[PDB]
Design an enzyme around this catalytic site. Sequence first.
Site, PDB file in Angstrom:
ATOM      1  N   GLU A 139       0.831  -1.214   0.000  1.00  0.00           N
ATOM      2  CA  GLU A 139       0.000   0.000   0.000  1.00  0.00           C
ATOM      3  C   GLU A 139       0.881   1.287   0.000  1.00  0.00           C
ATOM      4  O   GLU A 139       0.585   2.234  -0.762  1.00  0.00           O
ATOM      5  CB  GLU A 139      -1.031  -0.071   1.159  1.00  0.00           C
ATOM      6  CG  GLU A 139      -2.043  -1.321   1.200  1.00  0.00           C
ATOM      7  CD  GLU A 139      -3.268  -1.195   0.280  1.00  0.00           C
ATOM      8  OE1 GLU A 139      -3.465  -0.135  -0.304  1.00  0.00           O
ATOM      9  OE2 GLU A 139      -3.990  -2.122   0.106  1.00  0.00           O
ATOM     10  N   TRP A 143     -20.171 -20.966 -21.418  1.00  0.00           N
ATOM     11  CA  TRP A 143     -19.380 -20.683 -20.227  1.00  0.00           C
ATOM     12  C   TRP A 143     -18.600 -21.910 -19.785  1.00  0.00           C
ATOM     13  O   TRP A 143     -17.380 -21.857 -19.646  1.00  0.00           O
ATOM     14  CB  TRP A 143     -20.279 -20.197 -19.090  1.00  0.00           C
ATOM     15  CG  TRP A 143     -19.600 -20.111 -17.763  1.00  0.00           C
ATOM     16  CD1 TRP A 143     -19.808 -20.929 -16.710  1.00  0.00           C
ATOM     17  CD2 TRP A 143     -18.603 -19.166 -17.341  1.00  0.00           C
ATOM     18  NE1 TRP A 143     -19.017 -20.563 -15.666  1.00  0.00           N
ATOM     19  CE2 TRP A 143     -18.271 -19.488 -16.033  1.00  0.00           C
ATOM     20  CE3 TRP A 143     -17.977 -18.090 -17.957  1.00  0.00           C
ATOM     21  CZ2 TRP A 143     -17.332 -18.776 -15.324  1.00  0.00           C
ATOM     22  CZ3 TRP A 143     -17.034 -17.375 -17.247  1.00  0.00           C
ATOM     23  CH2 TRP A 143     -16.720 -17.714 -15.963  1.00  0.00           C
ATOM     24  N   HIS A 148     -16.830  -9.009  -9.075  1.00  0.00           N
ATOM     25  CA  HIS A 148     -16.515  -8.074 -10.147  1.00  0.00           C
ATOM     26  C   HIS A 148     -17.539  -8.076 -11.272  1.00  0.00           C
ATOM     27  O   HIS A 148     -17.748  -7.060 -11.931  1.00  0.00           O
ATOM     28  CB  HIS A 148     -15.141  -8.382 -10.732  1.00  0.00           C
ATOM     29  CG  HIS A 148     -14.035  -8.108  -9.794  1.00  0.00           C
ATOM     30  ND1 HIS A 148     -13.709  -8.960  -8.764  1.00  0.00           N
ATOM     31  CD2 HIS A 148     -13.166  -7.078  -9.722  1.00  0.00           C
ATOM     32  CE1 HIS A 148     -12.683  -8.464  -8.098  1.00  0.00           C
ATOM     33  NE2 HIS A 148     -12.334  -7.324  -8.661  1.00  0.00           N
TER      34      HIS A 148
END
Lengths: 675, 174
Positions: free
Chosen positions: A356, A458, A486
Amino acid sequence: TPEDLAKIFLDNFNSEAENLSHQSSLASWEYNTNISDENIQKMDEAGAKWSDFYETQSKHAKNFSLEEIHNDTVKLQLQILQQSGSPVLSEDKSKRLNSILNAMSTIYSTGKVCRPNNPQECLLLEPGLDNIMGTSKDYNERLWAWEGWRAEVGKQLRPLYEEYVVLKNEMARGYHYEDYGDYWRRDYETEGSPDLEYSRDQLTKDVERIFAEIKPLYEQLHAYVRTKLMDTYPFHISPTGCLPAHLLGDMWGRFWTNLYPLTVPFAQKPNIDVTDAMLNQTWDAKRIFKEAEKFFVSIGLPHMTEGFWNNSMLTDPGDGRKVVCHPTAWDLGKGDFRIKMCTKVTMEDFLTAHHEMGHIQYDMAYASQPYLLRNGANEGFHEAVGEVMSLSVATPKHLKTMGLLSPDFLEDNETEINFLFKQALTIVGTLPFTYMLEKWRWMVFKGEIPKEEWMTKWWEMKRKIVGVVEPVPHDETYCDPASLFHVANDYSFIRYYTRTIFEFQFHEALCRIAKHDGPLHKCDISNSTDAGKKLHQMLSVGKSQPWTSVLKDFVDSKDMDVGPLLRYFEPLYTWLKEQNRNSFVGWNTDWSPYADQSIKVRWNNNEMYLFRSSVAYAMREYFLKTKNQTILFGEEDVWVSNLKPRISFNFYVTSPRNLSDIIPRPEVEGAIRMS
Amino acid sequence: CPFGQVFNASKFPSVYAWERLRICVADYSVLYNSSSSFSTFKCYGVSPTKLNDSVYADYFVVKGDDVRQIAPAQTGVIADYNYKLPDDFTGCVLAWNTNSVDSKQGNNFYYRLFRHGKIKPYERDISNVLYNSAGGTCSSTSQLGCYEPLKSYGFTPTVGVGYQPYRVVVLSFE
Ligand SMILES: *[C@@H]1O[C@H](CO)[C@@H](O)[C@H](O)[C@H]1NC(C)=O
Ligand SMILES: *[C@@H]1O[C@H](CO)[C@@H](O)[C@H](O)[C@H]1NC(C)=O
Ligand SMILES: *[C@@H]1O[C@H](CO)[C@@H](O)[C@H](O)[C@H]1NC(C)=O
Ligand SMILES: *[C@@H]1O[C@H](CO)[C@@H](O)[C@H](O)[C@H]1NC(C)=O
Ligand SMILES: *[C@@H]1O[C@H](CO)[C@@H](O)[C@H](O)[C@H]1NC(C)=O
Ligand SMILES: *[C@@H]1O[C@H](CO)[C@@H](O)[C@H](O)[C@H]1NC(C)=O
Ligand SMILES: *[C@@H]1O[C@H](CO)[C@@H](O)[C@H](O)[C@H]1NC(C)=O
Ligand SMILES: *[C@@H]1O[C@H](CO)[C@@H](O)[C@H](O)[C@H]1NC(C)=O
Ligand SMILES: *[C@@H]1O[C@H](CO)[C@@H](O)[C@H](O)[C@H]1NC(C)=O
Ligand SMILES: [Zn+2]
């Protein structure tokens, strides 16, 4: 004249935006540090003002001609505003689309799976199911959690995703893009000289190229995991076939990290863990960040400012307020930089602190850029810069000089692989997942796959690309690629592919300038200012230059290159190769966990319903008449596989509501023959 | 002369509307005996060891990064539209960091960004009309090309040292 007018417009935008976006970001910080009903509405109010300003300015930006601008740092800023902030939709379609996205987010976030012995007991994903998939060794419990999630949340998001795709494509066409999938990857497009240009429709060609080059290593990792995993789940895994989706140590199969304890190269060798060293030496949460700073400073980067040290929430404050313990680096604007963490004295949170602080060094580096250009050269650069830093401080050499790893500690070539293997499960084992997930979405938005073929394509391509097979068949009422964070929340997933590729290009370049002599996986750029300043030059550019030229000046290439990744893991590759000598490497997409015991049958959904009902009927009478048993089979208990519409399909029947218990082929065949 | 009403003043004006007082015994106990107080201190045409042997003081609030524009022969938003000094300038410029005083909730300072031409040395423009980017005047900021010439400094208690308010006093020795 028209260029000067564009410049005046931008000067107004940038000076007005700088002290407005600040308030919206500041309000957001306060909310996440202090969660309250008052703070949430203030966050929204500040955000609303910023959003409204941006929209108006984006619309104004549309009536300036780009062809009349001779400046690159001006034309670029106009392009950014012109293609965002203002969707072209009817008010009814603006109310709607924002009502599907909120619905999908909520359904995902409140989704839970209940138990087939007990209804008032329901597990949630975050505090519940996630800690089962990553721990349990019970085939039957893993199947329940895996299937239950998809059969509970997945079935709710299907009709919403269908409306979502249609409306998003209409929106994307309002910006003159062919579709939404095309809109998403516009970020990789560059303009400039014929040698430094890149088309958005080139990305779909380049990621495929890199994948083909990766596959030969993935196959070796796959085969190894399969043969080792087979000793934990016997009779469930074939030596020539795909791995069951639910046995990968994850709800989605995104990472293979959790398989490590089952598939460890040298179980008699310990891994390095300095959590105990940090506690013994009396480390606190602050010391971790001070050491992270020292690392960056040693390579010539700027020290952290006082505002950072005094305002950041680096450690959970104790009590009196609820905080969001999700590590992230913030750029509040106007020189105000912060990190939000709930830091603990552990090794894993040591590496995180470095990661970070990698972000915050980058954010500082391009602070001098115009507001609209205060970003990375590419979306994949921001995480490549952050992650490449965690590789250099995970090296035992660093821990030894720091004093966290015991003095005179002995390391050898047996443990380097034990280590690389663990990393391969995170870095390599995730790439084929990311690749095919985004590829599928692109085809869906483009319109290559009809709604009726969503689930068939898929799983078809997933078995071909990843080598993973479903434990149970799924029809078109399911939407597996919607039960993941997501996809449900409208995020791009390609950025998790390209950053892995760039990460190692940056790693090798840095370890080369630092004059490392030895294996690429044991390099260290600490105390190397020659590598550090070279990096700084690449960071300070922001988005003012096309990523292709930004990369070239740092890595001496243009297109993304997996070479460095394959070299990093070369050792491991040459080791797995000599282990998989008696085993089969690769897989055949024609085996399934349920294909051994099924009946082949040789016409819309209403006809299939009747068929399944009929099968349940035959079962009820067969058992009652033959074994004097009363079992209530329903239509939901008859599963259909390999549907080839009108012509043929396979089916099998399970005990009522029991997924794992399949009726022996000779017994169900009996019921069919009987009636 | 009441230097205490300039250096120890409770409030300073915005840079777009700077104030000027005329300067008795020429004391220097507040300028050259405590130099740890000032963050910036530069003289032009005169040295600290010469000044001792009409002086009007111009004062205002400007952000740290723009302090560098308060000098002879400079260009920039402040140098061109708010506060200009002549190339042939004699005197001293002093500034100090007042983040703890000026960066509050209701304290709004402004600077001029747009104008039809540059300002002359020591000129003070405090008008407030809409600026037409195509020339002349206009109305309603909703119309493309219409902008407000005066913009605030986003001063808050927690922002970078280059975006923190400074109190500037310019002593021009004529
Ligand atoms: C959090 O916000 C609430 C609502 O305004 C406030 O009463 C409380 O004092 C705040 N907590 C802290 C530590 O400021
Ligand atoms: C663009 O500017 C021109 C020139 O003033 C004006 O004719 C036209 O109405 C404007 N177009 C838009 C979209 O505002
Ligand atoms: C573009 O404008 C910037 C100032 O905004 C200037 O420094 C740069 O040299 C200009 N580039 C070109 C090609 O005009
Ligand atoms: C660390 O562990 C060793 C074990 O040999 C112990 O002797 C030492 O006192 C411990 N350190 C502290 C600070 O207690
Ligand atoms: C943090 O704020 C306090 C306010 O009492 C100040 O005295 C301290 O010096 C500040 N920290 C830093 C690094 O300046
Ligand atoms: C960097 O150099 C310093 C001496 O200036 C040394 O103490 C430190 O251990 C070195 N760091 C590494 C990782 O070797
Ligand atoms: C480790 O290196 C030694 C030589 O020092 C070699 O004999 C041994 O086989 C290597 N271990 C592995 C797994 O290759
Ligand atoms: C304000 O007045 C006090 C008391 O005379 C003095 O010590 C201080 O230096 C003055 N401040 C300035 C900026 O001169
Ligand atoms: C204060 O100014 C006087 C006159 O210039 C000088 O003699 C004296 O040394 C200065 N005081 C300090 C502490 O420098
Ligand atoms: Zn990251």
